[PDB]
Amino acid sequence: ASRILLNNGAKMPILGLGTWKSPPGQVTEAVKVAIDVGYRHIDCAHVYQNENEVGVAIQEKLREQVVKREELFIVSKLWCTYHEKGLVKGACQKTLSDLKLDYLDLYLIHWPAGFKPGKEFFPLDESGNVVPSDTNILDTWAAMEELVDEGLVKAIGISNFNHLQVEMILNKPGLKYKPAVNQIECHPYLTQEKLIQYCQSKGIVVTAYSPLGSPDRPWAKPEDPSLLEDPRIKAIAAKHNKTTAQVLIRFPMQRNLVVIPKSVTPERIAENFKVFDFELSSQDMTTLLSYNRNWRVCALLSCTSHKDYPF
């Protein structure tokens, strides 16, 4: 099954295309190719600074009638400097404008922390620490709920929220819409069994980001572990006559997760979609789970002292 049912009643494609780091001069073609080869879910964010170019691609494929808008599942995210009551709607609207859409299928709080509003995405003090906002997560959630009620988004969710933070939202006094999704880092070196079982037990769908270990993350280092080169994963791939990436994409799908591998390489975009015609065994799945090292590629020192930093 290609889509998972969310607690808002809508169906979400379990495979999407990621767009963080996709250069603005490559990402329009990447998304055009993705839609042509079958993708129906695109993962976006204002902070990635490429939503206009993503939107050019989406718009051309809608115009050309390659796909219907109701067949697409477009996700974006509220950046940390817009957590304030009076800034959430305009942030969402900017994203809609850039993506050329009149609604999003899903809008996430990108990180639990709010930052001082302004032009800078990471406002710092003179000593290098991010400057917080005093807006708490529950007030930002209420602002997200209004976007549903105004028809700008069909579902709302969270991203990078830890157990305590998800629970805080679920226990919100007067909660109107539960989060549909929690999007978190997840791959064989960071398997997230505790947080995933918690979210799944509450009917929250988990999306796995960086499923290939984000080898293009700006802060990579030569010595770091490499999923795509791990000979044990290669061996599982070889047994199935698939690539390592295909194994790494199929793995979260069989955990009832959504997965959002990024590529701007047309051959790889196509290859990465070819994951609905094989099955990893239970043994394969447990073996991949056994590679957990609690190795997190998405973390940031400048934000570690923020009250709401999740890790």
Ligand X SMILES: NC(=O)c1ccc[n+]([C@@H]2O[C@H](COP(=O)([O-])OP(=O)(O)OC[C@H]3O[C@@H](n4cnc5c(N)ncnc54)[C@H](OP(=O)(O)O)[C@@H]3O)[C@@H](O)[C@H]2O)c1
Ligand Y SMILES: O=C(O)COc1cc(F)ccc1C(=S)NCc1ccc(Br)cc1F
Residues at the interface with ligand Y (CB under 6 A):
20, 45, 47-48, 80, 111, 113, 298-300, 303, 306, 309
Q: Which does 300 bind (CB under 5 to 8 A by kind): ligand Y, ligand X, Br ion, none?
A: ligand Y
Q: Is 28 in the site for ligand X (CB under 6 A)?
A: no
Report residue 203 as tokens.
């009917």
Binding test (CB under 6 A) with ligand X, winner from 76, 159, 191, 192: 159
Give the SS3 label for residue 157: strand
Report residue 141 as tokens.
């959630």
228 is in an annotated binding site: yes
74 is in an annotated binding site: no
How far is C-alpha 101 from the chain's CA centre? 19
Binding test (CB under 6 A) with ligand X, winner from 202, 268, 274, 291: 268
Q: How many CA atoms lie within 13 A of 30 on its CB side?
A: 29
Q: Cβ 137 to Br ion, closest distance in Å?
A: 10
In sequence order, which residues have a C-beta less than 8 Å from that of residue 309 and are 6 or more positions away? 112, 113, 303
Binding test (CB under 5 A) with Br ion, winner from 20, 107, 111, 189: 111
Give the SS3 label for residue 209: strand
Task: State the Cα–Cα distance between residues 52 and 23, nearest whole angstrom.
Answer: 12
Q: Is 113 in the site for Br ion (CB under 5 A)?
A: yes
302 to each of 118, 152, 165, how far by Cα in Å?
17, 32, 20
Q: Which does 260 bind (CB under 5 to 8 A by kind): ligand X, ligand Y, Br ion, none?
A: ligand X
In the complex with ligand X, the residue whose CB is nearer, 126 or 164, is: 164
175 is in an annotated binding site: no
Q: What is the DSSP letter of 230?
A: -
Report residue 38 as tokens.
């079958």
Q: Is 109 in the site for Br ion (CB under 5 A)?
A: no
Is 48 a residue of the active site? yes
213 is in an annotated binding site: yes
Give the SS3 label for residue 210: coil
In the complex with ligand X, the residue whose CB is nearer, 216 or 279, is: 216
Instruction: Pick the stretch among 18-26, 107-115, 258-266, 292-300 that binds Br ion (CB under 5 A).
Output: 107-115
Binding test (CB under 6 A) with ligand X, winner from 167, 216, 224, 229: 216
Phi and psi, residue 186, nearest 5°: -160, 125
Q: Which of 106, 101, 67 is nearest to 260 (CA)?
A: 106
Q: Site residues (CB under 6 A) for ligand X? A: 18-21, 43, 110, 159-160, 183, 209-217, 228, 243, 245, 260-265, 268, 271-272, 298
Active site residues per annotation:
48
Query: Which amino acids are annotated as binding site for NADP(+), given as ranges?
Result: 9-18, 210-272
